[PDB]
Amino acid sequence: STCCLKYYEKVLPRRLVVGYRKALNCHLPAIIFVTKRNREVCTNPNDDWVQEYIKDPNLPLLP
Amino acid sequence: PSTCCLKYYEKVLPRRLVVGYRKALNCHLPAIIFVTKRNREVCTNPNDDWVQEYIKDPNLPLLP
Amino acid sequence: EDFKCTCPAPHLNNTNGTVMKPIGCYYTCNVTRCTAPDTYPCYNLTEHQAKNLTTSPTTLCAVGNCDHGICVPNGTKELCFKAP
Amino acid sequence: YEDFKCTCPAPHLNNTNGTVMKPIGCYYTCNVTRCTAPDTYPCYNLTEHQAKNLTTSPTTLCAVGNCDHGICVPNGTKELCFKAP
């Protein structure tokens, strides 16, 4: 029920991310990465690092 | 020096790709311009830490 | 400091199959006050409608776009509600 | 990497104010991709006379403006422009 208004353009180190969420019914569709400190980071779903991160089976989608 | 930047490259540029740098500071968007292996000029924010650590490198020179 | 305004913000739902739109143009990441991008779609509510907003489609929201942090209404309307 | 689409420098003119350098328009080209200046970005709005007869000397009075939807909307202020050698 949340949407993203600014994309994180840098690459997020994998050691910080524990999971991800999807916010696609938004004006700026985004993949939301959740970090170790419970920080939600908005990223562009078309970026390759975002896609290569989601393909990781140790990086789960979180309900 | 007669060029200014209108969009910053926010991602981190791998050092192995860059051959040098220029400075464009008398601009509305002051920028450090990195020159890559294929002669591409890439605009970056001068306050970013990666950009500054690249300039501190004595093996990465300012280009006339 | 690259995480200043990259956090998600709460948005409202509709019943007409359009994108989700937030209350106003301002959202907070941690302690930082952030502003929506220009032209970003939003709802412009009265103080009455904000206190009487429910999880049910009962309120008619004015739709608008963000300009300098202000939700300028565009004249169109939708039913908005908060997700449970 | 399509992230290099519009991260290239653009040609700008010099002035005599001690102010920032300003481009001839709000549109710039990197490789083959057309890029647009950020909104409100400062620029010069010149007539074709001033553009074809512009020189490296401070001789032309340019209309100064800001970028709106890729267009240099004049703000009423003026400057002396010249191309840097």
Residue numbers in the entry:
A (entry chain D): 15 to 77
B (entry chain C): 14 to 77
C (entry chain B): 21 to 104
D (entry chain A): 20 to 104
Sentences from the paper on this structure:
We recently described class A3 evasins, which have 10 cysteines and an additional disulfide, and reported chemokine‐bound structures of the class A3 evasin EVA‐AAM1001 (Devkota et al., 2023). We now describe a structure–function analysis of EVA‐ACA1001, a class A3 evasin from Amblyomma cajennense (Cayenne tick).
To understand how the core of EVA‐ACA1001 defines broad‐spectrum binding, we determined the crystal structure of EVA‐ACA1001 in complex with the human chemokine CCL16 to a resolution of 2.7 Å resolution. The complex crystallized in 1:1 stoichiometry with two molecules per asymmetric unit. EVA‐ACA1001 comprises one β‐strand forming an anti‐parallel beta sheet with the CC motif of CCL16, two antiparallel β‐sheets, and two α‐ helices. The hydrophobic pocket is defined by the side chains of Cys27, Ala29, Pro30, His31, Pro42, Tyr47, Cys49, Pro57, and Tyr60 and by the Cys25–Cys54 disulfide bond, the unique disulfide in class A3 evasins. Notably, His31, Pro42, and Tyr60 form a hydrophobic cluster at the base of the hydrophobic pocket, which differs from the equivalent region of EVA‐AAM1001 and may contribute to the broader spectrum of chemokine binding by EVA‐ACA1001 (see Discussion).
